[PDB]
Amino acid sequence: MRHRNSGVKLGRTSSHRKAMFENLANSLFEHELIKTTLPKAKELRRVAEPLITLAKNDTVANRRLAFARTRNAATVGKLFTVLGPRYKERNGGYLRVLKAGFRAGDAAPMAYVELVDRE
Amino acid sequence: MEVTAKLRGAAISAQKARLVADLIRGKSVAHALNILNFSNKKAAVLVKKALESAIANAEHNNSLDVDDLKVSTIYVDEGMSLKRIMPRAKGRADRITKRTCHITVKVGV
Amino acid sequence: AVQQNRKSRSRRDMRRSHDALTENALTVDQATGETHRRHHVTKDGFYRGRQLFAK
Amino acid sequence: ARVKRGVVAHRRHKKILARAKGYYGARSRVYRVAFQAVIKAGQYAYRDRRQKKRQFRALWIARINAGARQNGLSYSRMIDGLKKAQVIIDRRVLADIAMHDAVAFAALAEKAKGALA
RNA sequence: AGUCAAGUAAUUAAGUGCAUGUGGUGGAUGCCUUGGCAGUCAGAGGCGAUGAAAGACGUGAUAGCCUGCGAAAAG
RNA sequence: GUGAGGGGAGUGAAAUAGAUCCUGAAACCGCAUGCAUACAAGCAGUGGGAGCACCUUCGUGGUGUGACUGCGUACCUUUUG
RNA sequence: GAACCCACUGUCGUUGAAAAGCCAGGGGAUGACUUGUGGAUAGGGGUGAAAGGCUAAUCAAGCCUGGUGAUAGCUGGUUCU
RNA sequence: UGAGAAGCAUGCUGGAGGUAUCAGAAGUGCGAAUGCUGACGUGAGUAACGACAAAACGGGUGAAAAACCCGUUCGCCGAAAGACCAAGGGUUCCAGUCCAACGUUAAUCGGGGCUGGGUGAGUCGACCCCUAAGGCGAGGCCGAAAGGCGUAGUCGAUGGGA
RNA sequence: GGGAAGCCUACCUCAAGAUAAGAUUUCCCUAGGACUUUAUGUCCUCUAAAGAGCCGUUCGAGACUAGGACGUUGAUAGGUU
Ligand SMILES: [Mg+2]
Ligand SMILES: [Mg+2]
Ligand SMILES: [Mg+2]
Ligand SMILES: [Mg+2]
Ligand SMILES: [Mg+2]
Ligand SMILES: [Mg+2]
Ligand SMILES: [Mg+2]
Ligand SMILES: [Mg+2]
Ligand SMILES: [Mg+2]
Ligand SMILES: [Mg+2]
Ligand SMILES: [Mg+2]
Ligand SMILES: [Mg+2]
Ligand SMILES: [Mg+2]
Ligand SMILES: [Mg+2]
Ligand SMILES: [Mg+2]
Ligand SMILES: [Mg+2]
């Protein structure tokens, strides 16, 4: 029974799942377009969008929090200098998840994660 | 009447391939190709290869138009099976059989 | 536990009678005019008037 | 003088399997079951060749009784009258007439009833 | 012509059973021998310190194996 | 897929004689046609029996299926059984 | 109390990862200690701080080849009309 | 067709042997022996896909990339899951090329197939000199034969010698 | 006639595969040919109704199913406030 429960497991421990989601967020912020599995893509929003929401205000405390959550100086820099001002007047919804068939390896459903205003 | 095409040594069992072969029996060539392209089964690529071979043979040798063709008959036959030995616990050994099948497709009209 | 008698081919086929496959939902795209899975991105990179992987 | 048992054994098995066409399951494919099936069929035929006469006689008696009760009599009384009227018609022709020719059976019943009186 | 009521036919096969036609795996049968088995009639009944029986390594088609041969090495 | 495999052309008396190569059976596994089958209980047959489908030397005929019905608890050994 | 040797309890495993194991605990750990290499003891024999224990996954008498196609008042099977 | 074991004629495949009547000899008739050999079914597309640690993304080749290559992040061992000798196995070592079979999946990858290369010693080890346990043993003692023991000797490292 | 925690009703749940397959309210489908074996006959031409399903966002529903809500005429899920 998981009535009114939010979250995923993906067959991983807490630390492995957290590190994988952080790495996925960093890769997405670096390349602006990635291809992953469907549940991972749908769960990436809840960890990616709060970072962009936090980056909308440029303060020392916000920078330190973004660094503590990302652990990447280049990512924090690119975020606060590019993605913050870009989505200044947008009320959420900075990601786009599009189904892209299945993987030829294990027939797993795939999906493209994209930014709404890239390139 | 019927343009035939045979694929021997499919490296798959007949029971797993009959499930895919039952889908395209009686359909047109375009619908069958569309169904086989967007499927995730393993025997689908073999059935698609056999169907494309049959269609190409019908176009080249008999000079039949492709829009009038349809999957008239299709079936799967058993083939030679390889025998291997698998070591079990307590020194026992079991016999494993790798199965193979042939696919026959005849397109008509 | 193991069976006491053989299972005739009739009962085997009656049990297998639920192993039929099903087709997918394929539609013709309005922009490219190609067959594609519904609610899925076309193999070339086009979906809903937009085009990914600009070339 | 070595002798091989291929041809004659194959022919015997083929004859036995051909004598058992139409059976269900292994009774039409396996020799071990087909032999027993053929033997049982032979025994059943031997018994039914005797049972058939009783079955048909019972059918004839039932039809004659129906006709006699239609003509206001019973089977026993009509048979007794026909035996007293010196009529030697068997039950087969009587049942055939009762099923097909109603006026002839009525005349026979009238003669039997007159002989009873 | 139509409503209402009562009675009563035909129509389904996800699958299966039987018969026939057409195929697959499989290597029984039929035909044949390149190999064995048992004898007759004639031989011989041994090889070796001048290095025997049995082996290792080498020698040409080109790389290997089988036969032949031994740095004079299919002579 | 410069793969495997197959369809044409050609050789061959013969290619379901194509190198997994004379003939090539049974168990076992597919496809097509014909009939029956989703309210009725058991060694799965036997004696009757309506209908349906193709044949015809067009029948009180042939080939398949066969609803409904009476009867019916496998084979061999060892035992009084 | 570590390496090393051993195997007292429990869980799991029992067509197992393994024809004797894993994990959590446990005992000895300067000695009657553990271990490498090379030798000796051969079957009514050897060895045994002694359990009928060990002697190539086999021990109230190891394995192989011959007598040998041992014997069985016992069990099973024994084919066309 | 006959009471039976069976006989006869013929449609399709097959491509070279078969054999009347009467006599003679049998390796002369299979459904069972937890019978022997080979092939194939049910279970069933079910169980299972093998300690201590974990993976994600971008690009490349390629018919096909979760497993290959390059790069960017994460995690584990570190008295070992690191680096070497002895025993043991002989090409598994390196390069090019391939995916039929092997890899408990695919594979462009490999300790897989094919082709071509690679091991350089006065100082390392072996060989050699010497010997322990032990083996063999000229003469010799004993024993039906085979043979047993053993002296002078000769071998035998796990030891000593630049 | 009286007569008990006993039986049938009464209380809660399931229930028309009850093949005896029930009832009620509403909604939908009203064209042109050929042939034969003139029959809810067989082939053609022309439309696919009311609805159901496939698919997607999902659930206080759920092993897979099934069931409930929604799909630009939208607050079904995520994000933002
Ligand atoms: Mg929720
Ligand atoms: Mg040569
Ligand atoms: Mg009833
Ligand atoms: Mg019925
Ligand atoms: Mg009958
Ligand atoms: Mg201690
Ligand atoms: Mg015999
Ligand atoms: Mg037999
Ligand atoms: Mg018997
Ligand atoms: Mg299960
Ligand atoms: Mg990748
Ligand atoms: Mg090699
Ligand atoms: Mg290589
Ligand atoms: Mg190699
Ligand atoms: Mg001595
Ligand atoms: Mg010496």
Side-chain angles (χ1 to χ4, degrees):
Chain A
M1 285 178 288
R2 49 145 299 272
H3 294 173
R4 313 273 275 179
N5 282 11
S6 53
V8 301
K9 288 174 168 51
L10 305 182
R12 288 167 162 82
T13 186
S14 298
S15 299
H16 184 193
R17 177 169 60 248
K18 182 177 176 182
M20 186 191 64
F21 277 144
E22 284 184 27
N23 281 325
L24 268 177
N26 290 333
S27 178
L28 176 62
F29 287 153
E30 176 180 1
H31 295 293
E32 309 189 274
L33 168 66
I34 58 176
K35 183 176 181 180
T36 182
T37 59
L38 183 53
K40 288 186 187 69
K42 283 193 175 181
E43 198 67 24
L44 185 54
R45 307 173 298 179
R46 311 217 315 161
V47 76
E49 302 202 23
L51 283 178
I52 303 182
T53 303
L54 177 73
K56 292 166 73 173
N57 298 119
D58 201 335
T59 51
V60 183
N62 286 338
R63 287 235 185 190
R64 289 190 176 182
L65 209 69
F67 177 75
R69 293 186 185 181
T70 53
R71 302 300 298 185
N72 200 15
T75 295
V76 172
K78 170 169 184 175
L79 203 61
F80 277 86
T81 65
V82 190
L83 299 194
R86 194 153 82 185
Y87 307 124
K88 187 56 182 178
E89 58 268 13
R90 182 176 289 266
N91 290 8
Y94 321 111
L95 293 184
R96 182 173 304 163
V97 180
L98 309 177
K99 305 165 196 57
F102 65 96
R103 186 152 59 191
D106 47 352
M110 308 300 292
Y112 279 115
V113 190
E114 188 207 83
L115 291 177
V116 291
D117 280 334
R118 62 176 272 255
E119 91 183 354
Chain B
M1 176 70 261
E2 298 295 328
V3 175
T4 187
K6 305 194 188 69
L7 192 142
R8 300 166 59 90
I12 196 183
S13 67
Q15 185 175 347
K16 296 172 186 175
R18 286 191 184 105
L19 299 185
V20 176
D22 273 348
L23 262 178
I24 72 167
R25 181 180 292 116
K27 314 296 185 60
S28 66
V29 290
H31 198 197
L33 281 173
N34 283 334
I35 288 182
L36 288 176
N37 276 118
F38 296 92
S39 62
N40 64 333
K41 312 289 288 188
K42 175 191 176 183
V45 300
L46 307 172
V47 176
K48 167 179 171 296
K49 184 185 301 298
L51 194 57
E52 293 191 81
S53 178
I55 294 173
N57 289 141
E59 289 177 349
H60 185 82
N61 300 134
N62 306 92
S63 179
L64 294 184
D65 208 313
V66 66
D67 41 19
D68 292 28
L69 294 179
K70 70 172 183 59
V71 192
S72 67
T73 62
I74 170 171
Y75 47 84
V76 186
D77 318 289
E78 297 176 351
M80 179 181 294
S81 66
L82 309 176
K83 304 165 188 175
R84 273 83 178 90
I85 298 297
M86 186 179 184
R88 302 304 293 262
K90 292 173 175 296
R92 306 197 198 98
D94 288 357
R95 177 75 66 86
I96 307 297
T97 61
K98 315 204 64 176
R99 302 185 177 274
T100 313
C101 70
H102 323 317
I103 311 178
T104 302
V105 173
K106 304 178 182 178
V107 288
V109 190
Chain C
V2 68
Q3 64 181 6
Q4 283 200 357
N5 296 116
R6 296 167 63 118
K7 178 175 291 296
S8 65
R9 62 208 82 185
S10 66
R11 310 307 297 180
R12 181 193 62 197
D13 301 329
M14 283 178 179
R15 183 193 55 209
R16 289 176 179 173
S17 178
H18 281 280
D19 292 354
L21 288 183
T22 189
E23 321 88 350
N24 300 270
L26 308 180
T27 65
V28 180
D29 195 79
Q30 193 269 332
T32 48
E34 295 293 328
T35 80
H36 79 105
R37 225 179 191 274
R38 192 158 188 260
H39 292 115
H40 277 45
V41 176
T42 310
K43 183 63 70 177
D44 70 333
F46 202 98
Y47 174 72
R48 207 177 190 182
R50 282 175 279 100
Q51 203 273 334
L52 288 84
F53 303 106
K55 301 173 183 177
Chain D
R2 185 163 179 260
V3 174
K4 314 188 71 175
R5 299 180 286 137
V7 183
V8 304
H10 180 243
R11 177 170 49 85
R12 287 176 64 97
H13 284 195
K14 170 147 295 302
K15 277 197 297 185
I16 290 298
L17 284 178
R19 283 181 54 186
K21 282 192 181 304
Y23 295 163
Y24 165 83
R27 300 175 171 264
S28 296
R29 301 165 175 83
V30 176
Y31 176 86
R32 290 175 182 251
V33 193
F35 191 71
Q36 312 176 186
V38 168
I39 298 304
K40 206 55 171 293
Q43 299 180 255
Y44 280 151
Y46 185 83
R47 182 205 61 187
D48 288 329
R49 272 202 295 274
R50 268 78 170 171
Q51 289 189 352
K52 176 184 179 182
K53 305 174 178 58
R54 322 174 197 172
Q55 292 181 1
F56 268 98
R57 184 179 174 90
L59 179 62
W60 297 332
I61 287 185
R63 283 189 181 175
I64 294 171
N65 198 349
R69 294 198 176 276
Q70 267 197 9
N71 274 273
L73 270 177
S74 294
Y75 174 83
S76 296
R77 288 311 170 190
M78 180 177 181
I79 285 295
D80 186 9
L82 283 182
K83 287 187 177 303
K84 285 183 173 59
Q86 305 300 111
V87 191
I88 58 181
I89 303 179
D90 64 335
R91 285 149 180 79
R92 180 160 162 257
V93 180
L94 283 182
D96 192 12
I97 290 178
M99 184 184 178
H100 288 101
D101 202 314
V103 56
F105 195 81
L108 279 160
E110 285 293 328
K111 186 163 190 173
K113 187 181 288 185
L116 270 178

PDB file of all heavy atoms in Angstrom, chain D residues 87-98:
ATOM      1  N   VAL D  87     -53.789 -65.617 -36.557  1.00  0.00           N
ATOM      2  CA  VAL D  87     -52.936 -64.708 -37.314  1.00  0.00           C
ATOM      3  C   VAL D  87     -51.491 -64.924 -36.884  1.00  0.00           C
ATOM      4  O   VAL D  87     -51.187 -64.945 -35.685  1.00  0.00           O
ATOM      5  CB  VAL D  87     -53.362 -63.246 -37.100  1.00  0.00           C
ATOM      6  CG1 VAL D  87     -52.653 -62.338 -38.091  1.00  0.00           C
ATOM      7  CG2 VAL D  87     -54.868 -63.104 -37.221  1.00  0.00           C
ATOM      8  N   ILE D  88     -50.598 -65.078 -37.859  1.00  0.00           N
ATOM      9  CA  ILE D  88     -49.198 -65.376 -37.591  1.00  0.00           C
ATOM     10  C   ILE D  88     -48.281 -64.243 -38.050  1.00  0.00           C
ATOM     11  O   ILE D  88     -47.105 -64.467 -38.312  1.00  0.00           O
ATOM     12  CB  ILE D  88     -48.785 -66.715 -38.229  1.00  0.00           C
ATOM     13  CG1 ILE D  88     -49.032 -66.684 -39.737  1.00  0.00           C
ATOM     14  CG2 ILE D  88     -49.538 -67.865 -37.584  1.00  0.00           C
ATOM     15  CD1 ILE D  88     -48.680 -67.974 -40.439  1.00  0.00           C
ATOM     16  N   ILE D  89     -48.807 -63.023 -38.151  1.00  0.00           N
ATOM     17  CA  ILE D  89     -47.979 -61.887 -38.535  1.00  0.00           C
ATOM     18  C   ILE D  89     -47.053 -61.518 -37.385  1.00  0.00           C
ATOM     19  O   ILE D  89     -47.483 -61.392 -36.230  1.00  0.00           O
ATOM     20  CB  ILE D  89     -48.859 -60.696 -38.951  1.00  0.00           C
ATOM     21  CG1 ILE D  89     -49.803 -61.104 -40.082  1.00  0.00           C
ATOM     22  CG2 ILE D  89     -48.001 -59.521 -39.379  1.00  0.00           C
ATOM     23  CD1 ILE D  89     -50.731 -59.999 -40.528  1.00  0.00           C
ATOM     24  N   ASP D  90     -45.770 -61.342 -37.695  1.00  0.00           N
ATOM     25  CA  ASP D  90     -44.777 -61.033 -36.678  1.00  0.00           C
ATOM     26  C   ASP D  90     -44.907 -59.578 -36.231  1.00  0.00           C
ATOM     27  O   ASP D  90     -45.728 -58.811 -36.740  1.00  0.00           O
ATOM     28  CB  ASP D  90     -43.374 -61.328 -37.203  1.00  0.00           C
ATOM     29  CG  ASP D  90     -42.993 -60.450 -38.373  1.00  0.00           C
ATOM     30  OD1 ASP D  90     -43.905 -59.979 -39.082  1.00  0.00           O
ATOM     31  OD2 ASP D  90     -41.782 -60.232 -38.586  1.00  0.00           O
ATOM     32  N   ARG D  91     -44.076 -59.191 -35.261  1.00  0.00           N
ATOM     33  CA  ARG D  91     -44.187 -57.855 -34.684  1.00  0.00           C
ATOM     34  C   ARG D  91     -43.592 -56.789 -35.594  1.00  0.00           C
ATOM     35  O   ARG D  91     -43.975 -55.618 -35.502  1.00  0.00           O
ATOM     36  CB  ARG D  91     -43.514 -57.818 -33.315  1.00  0.00           C
ATOM     37  CG  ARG D  91     -44.318 -58.490 -32.216  1.00  0.00           C
ATOM     38  CD  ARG D  91     -43.410 -59.098 -31.165  1.00  0.00           C
ATOM     39  NE  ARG D  91     -44.163 -59.752 -30.098  1.00  0.00           N
ATOM     40  CZ  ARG D  91     -44.702 -60.963 -30.197  1.00  0.00           C
ATOM     41  NH1 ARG D  91     -44.576 -61.659 -31.318  1.00  0.00           N
ATOM     42  NH2 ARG D  91     -45.370 -61.477 -29.175  1.00  0.00           N
ATOM     43  N   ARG D  92     -42.668 -57.167 -36.478  1.00  0.00           N
ATOM     44  CA  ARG D  92     -42.043 -56.187 -37.362  1.00  0.00           C
ATOM     45  C   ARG D  92     -43.054 -55.609 -38.345  1.00  0.00           C
ATOM     46  O   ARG D  92     -43.185 -54.385 -38.473  1.00  0.00           O
ATOM     47  CB  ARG D  92     -40.873 -56.833 -38.102  1.00  0.00           C
ATOM     48  CG  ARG D  92     -40.142 -55.908 -39.054  1.00  0.00           C
ATOM     49  CD  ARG D  92     -38.752 -56.436 -39.353  1.00  0.00           C
ATOM     50  NE  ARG D  92     -38.175 -55.829 -40.547  1.00  0.00           N
ATOM     51  CZ  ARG D  92     -38.096 -56.436 -41.727  1.00  0.00           C
ATOM     52  NH1 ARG D  92     -38.558 -57.670 -41.870  1.00  0.00           N
ATOM     53  NH2 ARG D  92     -37.553 -55.811 -42.762  1.00  0.00           N
ATOM     54  N   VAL D  93     -43.781 -56.479 -39.048  1.00  0.00           N
ATOM     55  CA  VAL D  93     -44.784 -56.015 -40.002  1.00  0.00           C
ATOM     56  C   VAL D  93     -45.912 -55.291 -39.280  1.00  0.00           C
ATOM     57  O   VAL D  93     -46.465 -54.309 -39.792  1.00  0.00           O
ATOM     58  CB  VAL D  93     -45.305 -57.197 -40.838  1.00  0.00           C
ATOM     59  CG1 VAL D  93     -46.350 -56.728 -41.836  1.00  0.00           C
ATOM     60  CG2 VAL D  93     -44.153 -57.880 -41.554  1.00  0.00           C
ATOM     61  N   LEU D  94     -46.267 -55.751 -38.078  1.00  0.00           N
ATOM     62  CA  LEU D  94     -47.310 -55.077 -37.312  1.00  0.00           C
ATOM     63  C   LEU D  94     -46.897 -53.656 -36.952  1.00  0.00           C
ATOM     64  O   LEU D  94     -47.693 -52.720 -37.087  1.00  0.00           O
ATOM     65  CB  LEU D  94     -47.637 -55.873 -36.050  1.00  0.00           C
ATOM     66  CG  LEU D  94     -48.500 -57.122 -36.230  1.00  0.00           C
ATOM     67  CD1 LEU D  94     -48.767 -57.779 -34.887  1.00  0.00           C
ATOM     68  CD2 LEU D  94     -49.802 -56.779 -36.929  1.00  0.00           C
ATOM     69  N   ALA D  95     -45.655 -53.474 -36.496  1.00  0.00           N
ATOM     70  CA  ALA D  95     -45.177 -52.134 -36.172  1.00  0.00           C
ATOM     71  C   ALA D  95     -45.093 -51.262 -37.418  1.00  0.00           C
ATOM     72  O   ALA D  95     -45.434 -50.073 -37.374  1.00  0.00           O
ATOM     73  CB  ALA D  95     -43.819 -52.214 -35.479  1.00  0.00           C
ATOM     74  N   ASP D  96     -44.645 -51.834 -38.538  1.00  0.00           N
ATOM     75  CA  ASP D  96     -44.579 -51.075 -39.782  1.00  0.00           C
ATOM     76  C   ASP D  96     -45.962 -50.587 -40.199  1.00  0.00           C
ATOM     77  O   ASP D  96     -46.139 -49.421 -40.574  1.00  0.00           O
ATOM     78  CB  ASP D  96     -43.954 -51.933 -40.882  1.00  0.00           C
ATOM     79  CG  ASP D  96     -43.591 -51.128 -42.113  1.00  0.00           C
ATOM     80  OD1 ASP D  96     -43.610 -49.883 -42.038  1.00  0.00           O
ATOM     81  OD2 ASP D  96     -43.287 -51.744 -43.156  1.00  0.00           O
ATOM     82  N   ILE D  97     -46.962 -51.469 -40.126  1.00  0.00           N
ATOM     83  CA  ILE D  97     -48.321 -51.087 -40.493  1.00  0.00           C
ATOM     84  C   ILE D  97     -48.859 -50.038 -39.528  1.00  0.00           C
ATOM     85  O   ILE D  97     -49.462 -49.043 -39.945  1.00  0.00           O
ATOM     86  CB  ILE D  97     -49.227 -52.330 -40.547  1.00  0.00           C
ATOM     87  CG1 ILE D  97     -48.855 -53.205 -41.744  1.00  0.00           C
ATOM     88  CG2 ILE D  97     -50.689 -51.926 -40.616  1.00  0.00           C
ATOM     89  CD1 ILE D  97     -49.660 -54.478 -41.841  1.00  0.00           C
ATOM     90  N   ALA D  98     -48.638 -50.234 -38.226  1.00  0.00           N
ATOM     91  CA  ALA D  98     -49.124 -49.275 -37.239  1.00  0.00           C
ATOM     92  C   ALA D  98     -48.510 -47.900 -37.454  1.00  0.00           C
ATOM     93  O   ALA D  98     -49.164 -46.876 -37.219  1.00  0.00           O
ATOM     94  CB  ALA D  98     -48.826 -49.778 -35.828  1.00  0.00           C
TER      95      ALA D  98
END
